[PDB]
Structure 1
Protein backbone atom coordinates (compact mmCIF):
# COMPACT_ATOMS: atom_id res chain seq x y z
CA UNK A 1 0.00 0.00 0.00
CA UNK A 2 1.08 3.58 -0.65
CA UNK A 3 1.05 4.54 3.03
CA UNK A 4 3.45 1.72 3.87
CA UNK A 5 5.79 2.80 1.06
CA UNK A 6 5.83 6.38 2.32
CA UNK A 7 6.43 5.22 5.90
CA UNK A 8 9.34 3.03 4.79
CA UNK A 9 10.90 5.88 2.82
CA UNK A 10 10.59 8.24 5.79
CA UNK A 11 12.10 5.67 8.16
CA UNK A 12 15.03 5.06 5.81
CA UNK A 13 15.64 8.80 5.47
CA UNK A 14 15.66 9.21 9.26
CA UNK A 15 18.05 6.28 9.63
CA UNK A 16 20.37 7.79 7.02
CA UNK A 17 20.32 11.24 8.65
CA UNK A 18 20.58 10.06 12.27
CA UNK A 19 23.12 11.99 14.36
CA UNK A 20 25.70 9.52 15.63
CA UNK A 21 29.30 10.38 16.50
CA UNK A 22 30.66 6.81 16.42
CA UNK A 23 31.85 6.91 12.77
CA UNK A 24 33.96 10.02 13.39
CA UNK A 25 35.14 8.70 16.76
CA UNK A 26 36.41 5.52 15.09
CA UNK A 27 38.20 7.60 12.43
CA UNK A 28 39.83 10.29 14.59
CA UNK A 29 40.16 9.10 18.19
CA UNK A 30 40.03 5.32 18.60
CA UNK A 31 43.41 4.72 16.86
CA UNK A 32 45.05 7.20 19.25
CA UNK A 33 43.61 5.39 22.28
CA UNK A 34 44.75 2.03 20.91
CA UNK A 35 48.25 3.39 20.25
CA UNK A 36 48.47 4.82 23.77
CA UNK A 37 47.28 1.60 25.40
CA UNK A 38 49.35 -0.80 23.25
CA UNK A 39 52.83 -0.49 24.87
CA UNK A 40 51.48 -1.32 28.35
CA UNK A 41 49.80 -4.68 27.65
CA UNK A 42 51.24 -7.87 29.17
CA UNK A 43 50.73 -9.58 25.81
CA UNK A 44 52.11 -7.44 22.97
CA UNK A 45 50.09 -7.18 19.75
CA UNK A 46 50.51 -9.89 17.11
CA UNK A 47 49.20 -9.00 13.67
CA UNK A 48 49.22 -10.02 10.02
CA UNK A 49 48.56 -7.62 7.13
Structure 2
Protein backbone atom coordinates (compact mmCIF):
# COMPACT_ATOMS: atom_id res chain seq x y z
CA UNK A 1 0.00 0.00 0.00
CA UNK A 2 2.68 2.40 -1.39
CA UNK A 3 3.79 3.74 2.01
CA UNK A 4 5.66 0.53 2.51
CA UNK A 5 6.98 0.98 -1.04
CA UNK A 6 8.25 4.46 -0.20
CA UNK A 7 9.65 3.45 3.19
CA UNK A 8 11.29 0.41 1.60
CA UNK A 9 13.04 2.56 -0.99
CA UNK A 10 14.07 5.07 1.65
CA UNK A 11 15.36 2.35 3.96
CA UNK A 12 17.35 0.90 1.07
CA UNK A 13 18.91 4.24 0.11
CA UNK A 14 19.78 5.21 3.66
CA UNK A 15 21.16 1.73 4.38
CA UNK A 16 23.27 2.17 1.26
CA UNK A 17 24.62 5.44 2.61
CA UNK A 18 25.25 4.47 6.24
CA UNK A 19 28.73 5.33 7.45
CA UNK A 20 31.16 2.55 8.35
CA UNK A 21 34.94 2.61 8.51
CA UNK A 22 35.04 -1.19 8.17
CA UNK A 23 35.35 -1.43 4.33
CA UNK A 24 38.29 0.97 4.16
CA UNK A 25 39.75 -0.83 7.16
CA UNK A 26 39.65 -4.06 5.17
CA UNK A 27 40.91 -2.29 2.05
CA UNK A 28 43.84 -0.41 3.61
CA UNK A 29 44.87 -1.29 7.14
CA UNK A 30 43.91 -4.90 7.85
CA UNK A 31 46.29 -6.57 5.33
CA UNK A 32 49.08 -4.30 6.59
CA UNK A 33 48.47 -5.39 10.18
CA UNK A 34 48.02 -8.97 9.01
CA UNK A 35 51.37 -8.90 7.22
CA UNK A 36 53.08 -7.46 10.29
CA UNK A 37 51.59 -10.29 12.37
CA UNK A 38 52.18 -13.09 9.87
CA UNK A 39 55.81 -14.07 10.70
CA UNK A 40 55.18 -14.04 14.46
CA UNK A 41 53.24 -17.31 14.27
CA UNK A 42 53.64 -20.80 15.69
CA UNK A 43 51.77 -22.01 12.61
CA UNK A 44 53.40 -20.45 9.55
CA UNK A 45 51.17 -19.40 6.65
CA UNK A 46 50.12 -21.94 4.07
CA UNK A 47 48.04 -20.76 1.14
CA UNK A 48 46.49 -22.10 -2.04
CA UNK A 49 45.95 -19.42 -4.71
TM over 0.5: yes
Equivalent-residue separation in structure 1 for 2:11 and 2:35 (angstroms)? 38
* Structure 1 or 2: more helix by fraction: 1
> 1-side partners of 2:38 and 2:20: how far apart?
27
Structure 1 gaps, min length 5: none
| Number of equivalences | 49
Answering whether residue 29 of structure 2 is matched by residue 7 of structure 1, we say no
**TM-score, normalization by structure 2:** 0.96
Aligned ranges 1:26-45 → 2 under 5 Å: 26-45=26-45
Using the size of structure 1 for normalisation, the TM-score is 0.96
**Within 1, Cα distance between the matches of 2:18 and 2:30?**
21
